Motif scaffolding. Structure first.
Motif, PDB file in Angstrom:
ATOM      1  N   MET A   1    -126.231  46.120  64.473  1.00 37.65           N
ATOM      2  CA  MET A   1    -127.317  47.076  64.556  1.00 37.65           C
ATOM      3  C   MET A   1    -128.605  46.331  64.187  1.00 37.65           C
ATOM      4  O   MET A   1    -128.556  45.373  63.438  1.00 37.65           O
ATOM      5  CB  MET A   1    -127.110  48.101  63.446  1.00 37.65           C
ATOM      6  CG  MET A   1    -127.367  49.483  63.942  1.00 37.65           C
ATOM      7  SD  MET A   1    -125.817  50.218  64.500  1.00 37.65           S
ATOM      8  CE  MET A   1    -126.585  51.524  63.587  1.00 37.65           C
TER       9      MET A   1
ATOM     10  N   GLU B   1    -120.093  54.621  57.411  1.00 39.92           N
ATOM     11  CA  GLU B   1    -120.958  55.339  58.339  1.00 39.92           C
ATOM     12  C   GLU B   1    -120.465  55.218  59.782  1.00 39.92           C
ATOM     13  O   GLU B   1    -119.606  54.379  60.102  1.00 39.92           O
ATOM     14  CB  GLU B   1    -122.375  54.796  58.260  1.00 39.92           C
ATOM     15  CG  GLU B   1    -122.982  54.959  56.868  1.00 39.92           C
ATOM     16  CD  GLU B   1    -124.289  54.211  56.673  1.00 39.92           C
ATOM     17  OE1 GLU B   1    -124.427  53.047  57.097  1.00 39.92           O
ATOM     18  OE2 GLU B   1    -125.162  54.794  56.018  1.00 39.92           O
ATOM     19  N   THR B   2    -120.927  56.123  60.656  1.00 31.10           N
ATOM     20  CA  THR B   2    -120.574  56.043  62.065  1.00 31.10           C
ATOM     21  C   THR B   2    -121.867  55.899  62.858  1.00 31.10           C
ATOM     22  O   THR B   2    -122.852  56.600  62.568  1.00 31.10           O
ATOM     23  CB  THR B   2    -119.839  57.302  62.545  1.00 31.10           C
ATOM     24  OG1 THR B   2    -118.535  57.318  61.969  1.00 31.10           O
ATOM     25  CG2 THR B   2    -119.552  57.327  64.043  1.00 31.10           C
TER      26      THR B   2
END
Ligand SMILES: CN[C@H]1CCCN(c2cccnn2)C1
Length: 93
Positions: free
Chosen positions: A15, A49-50
């Motif tokens: 990310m 987290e997703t």
């Protein structure tokens, strides 16, 4: 030869602004929100987290761990390294 990504596959997931992160392709539970087209639900170890990501940000874990599987100062990362190595298919609910 490689197949497409499937639930249970182990990856490092990239990310913006974050190091390549230990993660898995999740299943989608009956009744739960589905990802956008061409995207997979990625569960991030350590943070739990997703996010939804496409294959360009998914690095298979076996090939990549020598490069990306070293301790990081970032919150949750080293817990994440333990999870992906030691119990990558557990419930972290
Ligand atoms: C490891 N820190 C970031 C990595 C990518 C996933 N992140 C999300 C996604 C959706 C919701 N909350 N956090 C946390």
């Amino acid at each position: 030869m490689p197949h497409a990504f499937k639930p249970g596959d182990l990856v490092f997931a990239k990310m913006k602004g974050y190091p390549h992160w230990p993660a898995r392709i999740d299943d989608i539970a009956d009744g739960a929100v589905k990802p956008p087209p061409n995207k997979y639900p990625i569960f991030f170890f350590g943070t739990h987290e997703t996010a939804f990501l496409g294959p360009k940000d998914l690095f298979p874990y076996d090939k990549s761990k020598d490069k990306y599987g070293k301790p990081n100062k970032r919150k949750g990362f080293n817990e994440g390294l333990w999870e992906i190595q030691n119990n990558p298919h557990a419930s972290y609910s």
